[PDB]
Design a protein around this ligand. Structure first.
Ligand SMILES: *[C@@H]1O[C@H](CO)[C@@H](O[C@@H]2O[C@H](CO)[C@@H](O[C@@H]3O[C@H](CO)[C@@H](O)[C@H](O[C@H]4O[C@H](CO)[C@@H](O)[C@H](O)[C@@H]4O)[C@@H]3O)[C@H](O)[C@H]2NC(C)=O)[C@H](O)[C@H]1NC(C)=O
Ligand SMILES: *[C@@H]1O[C@H](CO)[C@@H](O[C@@H]2O[C@H](CO)[C@@H](O)[C@H](O)[C@H]2NC(C)=O)[C@H](O)[C@H]1NC(C)=O
Ligand SMILES: *[C@@H]1O[C@H](CO)[C@@H](O[C@@H]2O[C@H](CO)[C@@H](O)[C@H](O)[C@H]2NC(C)=O)[C@H](O)[C@H]1NC(C)=O
Ligand SMILES: *[C@@H]1O[C@H](CO)[C@@H](O)[C@H](O)[C@H]1NC(C)=O
Ligand SMILES: *[C@@H]1O[C@H](CO)[C@@H](O)[C@H](O)[C@H]1NC(C)=O
Ligand SMILES: *[C@@H]1O[C@H](CO)[C@@H](O)[C@H](O)[C@H]1NC(C)=O
Ligand SMILES: *[C@@H]1O[C@H](CO)[C@@H](O)[C@H](O)[C@H]1NC(C)=O
Lengths: 287, 299
């Protein structure tokens, strides 16, 4: 069943700067104390990424449509995990194959079918009175499925769902790419207790799983949790989206096989010099 | 300096991933409830590595009928999708499963096109089929007014009218009637001895093609210059035990020279080592042929 939300506040999107974030292992090769350089799809250092706010204030909501470039970097700041899942496709009207990934209190679903999506897909969790528990009472993301190719159910995941207004408890970083009919997802989960201005430091994104699909993807749309207790209690969750470009990076593997540093070879000419000598320290002279 | 010296490999260990998970396709072949020829069954199965040597040596299959595809090479082939079916064909109509025929249900029910690989196999059915009295629930086509085409479905849930007489709930002399029943005669010849048949179709199209076949795995050897054929990697060397700590997802191992030197075991998840096996140059030492005729060899 398809519905829509009314009486919502609209706000312009903001911009924020990526402070050397978005590094992931491009290969499955172990290295020890090496300065290997590679040219792949990456997120350039020190650039705008757009910022959408899902604050409850008054009655503000956000769920826009963003085109899918060659790669997507999704950085969510969460306290009670309001954000749940994503949908990928071109038309999103059951006329073409489309992917849907959700991880709810029930079993995790990764399903590439034809779904008749609604104008405002969402998930609705009700705060019942007979027991003080939150259970999913509204599945209105799409109408129905017709005929499919690849459906997968992962292990069930249990996580408390509440509408809170506190500081973000954790950060979830995801990188989505689509090459050679393969959908590759790189995931990382980190703890922090900040409010904005994403922390410094380098955090490599380990790969999670690869999905063989082989479909066009030019548009993606995320979905939230619409709690019930008219009223929706959207919370104050935040998520950032960024796009990837072909860039050459210099990676420094430690003794354990874990990436600890990287240098973008498109920044100020000092970075170019560091990218030529294959070292992080350059002495005086002319190069 | 005289020549060079090299050590040849002996074994060809071919270790692959651990185990195939499952493929319930055999269950599709081996259930208890099935429809008739009127049901153009089409069961699509993908992302499943399935055993094929079982069908070549099974219990009561016998009538193995594949078309112009080599029988042996298809077990170790990898495709994108497979299709299934099940119904009763009444003995001699085994001839109708051919690449192009129109005499009978070869085109009436479960139409098969020409140049369609579709390995087909049937078996004798004397207890499930040819039952006592006759289970007339099964139906076969009367005339097939659908006028099918290669790879089409004949679904005629209505009745004929020739040119004059409507037959909408009225006994029409020219309106004929729906599909005739199935004469499961108790004990008779091939003309009254039904058979149950199943077809396995293949199609590649353009996809990642994650429907592969089973692969073997030989035991490993250590401390011996042998030929190794790990997943993707093919080479020669001596495999021993190392002490490097790998990440829970990395599989390969490289160095500054970008040459593979450590392989993770796909079965037991153990980190090995790679080293060339004792190549060198041989040289002789002589005190001068005038004084004596003795030599010493330096390796
Ligand atoms: C890939 O498939 C193989 C084949 O099934 C599988 O190997 C077997 O795994 C099971 C567990 O899944 C092993 O069972 C136990 O394994 C533990 C840990 O390896 C062993 O320590 C146990 O055996 C010990 O105790 C025995 C009795 O005291 C001793 O006789 C023995 O030597 C050990 O000390 C126990 O068997 C099973 O042993 C292995 N079999 C072999 C031949 O390795 C493997 O686990 C699968 N791997 C993956 C990643 O799927
Ligand atoms: C890299 O791996 C090594 C593995 O040895 C880690 O070394 C550990 O160091 C701490 C320091 O007190 C010891 O208590 C541990 O016992 C060591 N590990 C082992 C297995 O003995 C090291 O921490 C890892 N990380 C880095 C950055 O070197
Ligand atoms: C169909 O089901 C029958 C059950 O009677 C299977 O017959 C035996 O099944 C077991 C278990 O797989 C095998 O170990 C035996 O070898 C089978 N008997 C014979 C004579 O082969 C039969 O294998 C099943 N057919 C399938 C699974 O294709
Ligand atoms: C992001 O916004 C615009 C680009 O359109 C630019 O003026 C601004 O400087 C950018 N941000 C930073 C930190 O440079
Ligand atoms: C799948 O769904 C579409 C939409 O109705 C339909 O046109 C198509 O024939 C179906 N089957 C296949 C194999 O694509
Ligand atoms: C995906 O887009 C390419 C670009 O033209 C097209 O050639 C291909 O047919 C598309 N695949 C589909 C629609 O499955
Ligand atoms: C070999 O050595 C002896 C040592 O006395 C010498 O007399 C002789 O001439 C040598 N041979 C030749 C061919 O010079």
């Amino acid at each position: 069943q398809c519905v829509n939300l009314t009486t919502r506040t609209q706000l312009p999107p903001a911009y924020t700067n990526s402070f050397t974030r978005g590094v992931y292992y491009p290969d499955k090769v172990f290295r020890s104390s090496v300065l290997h350089s590679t040219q792949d799809l990456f997120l350039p250092f020190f650039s705008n990424v757009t910022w959408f706010h899902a604050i409850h204030v008054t009655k503000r909501f956000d769920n826009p449509v963003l085109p899918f470039n060659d790669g997507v970097y999704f950085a969510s700041t969460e306290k009670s995990n309001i954000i749940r899942g994503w949908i990928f496709g071109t038309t999103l009207d059951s006329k073409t194959q489309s992917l849907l990934i959700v991880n709810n209190a029930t079993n995790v679903v990764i399903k590439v079918c034809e779904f008749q999506f609604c104008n405002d897909p969402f998930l609705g969790v009700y705060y019942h009175k007979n027991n003080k528990s939150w259970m999913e009472s509204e599945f209105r993301v799409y109408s129905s499925a017709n005929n499919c190719t690849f459906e997968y159910v992962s292990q069930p995941f249990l996580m408390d769902l509440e509408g809170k207004q506190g500081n973000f408890k954790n950060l979830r970083e995801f990188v989505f790419k689509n090459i050679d009919g393969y959908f590759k997802i790189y995931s990382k989960h980190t703890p922090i207790n900040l409010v904005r201005d994403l922390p410094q430091g380098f955090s490599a994104l380990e790969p999670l799983v690869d999905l063989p699909i082989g479909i066009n993807i030019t548009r993606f749309q995320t979905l939230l949790a619409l709690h019930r207790s008219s009223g929706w209690t959207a919370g104050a969750a935040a998520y950032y989206v960024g796009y990837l470009q072909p860039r050459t990076f210099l990676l420094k593997y430690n003794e354990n096989g874990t990436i600890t540093d990287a240098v973008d070879c498109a920044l100020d000419p000092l970075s170019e010099t560091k990218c030529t000598l294959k070292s992080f320290t350059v002495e005086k002279g002319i190069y | 300096q005289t020549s060079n010296f090299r050590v040849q490999p002996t074994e060809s260990i071919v270790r692959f991933p651990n185990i195939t998970n499952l493929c319930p396709f055999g269950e599709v072949f081996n259930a208890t409830r099935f429809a008739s020829v009127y049901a153009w069954n089409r069961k699509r199965i993908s992302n499943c590595v399935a055993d094929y040597s079982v069908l070549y040596n099974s219990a009561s299959f016998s009538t193995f009928k594949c078309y112009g595809v080599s029988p042996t090479k298809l077990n170790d082939l990898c495709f994108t999708n497979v299709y299934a079916d099940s119904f009763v064909i009444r003995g001699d109509e085994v001839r109708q499963i051919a690449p192009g025929q129109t005499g009978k249900i070869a085109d009436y029910n479960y139409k098969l096109p020409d140049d369609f690989t579709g390995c087909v196999i049937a078996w004798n059915s004397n207890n499930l089929d040819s039952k006592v009295g006759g289970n007339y629930n099964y139906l076969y086509r009367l005339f097939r007014k659908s006028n099918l085409k290669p790879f089409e479905r004949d679904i005629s849930t209505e009745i004929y009218q020739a040119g004059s007489t409507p037959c909408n709930g009225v006994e029409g002399f020219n309106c004929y009637f729906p599909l005739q029943s199935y004469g499961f005669q108790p004990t008779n010849g091939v003309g009254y001895q039904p058979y149950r048949v199943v077809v396995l179709s293949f199609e590649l199209l353009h996809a990642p093609a994650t429907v592969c076949g089973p692969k073997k795995s030989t035991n490993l050897v250590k401390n011996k210059c042998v030929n190794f054929n790990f997943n993707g990697l093919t080479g020669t060397g001596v495999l021993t035990e190392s002490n490097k700590k790998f990440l829970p997802f990395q599989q390969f191992g490289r160095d500054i020279a970008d040459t593979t030197d450590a392989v993770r075991d796909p079965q037991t998840l153990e980190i090995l080592d790679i080293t060339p096996c004792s190549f060198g140059g041989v040289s002789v030492i002589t005190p001068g042929t005038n004084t004596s005729n003795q030599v010493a060899v330096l390796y």
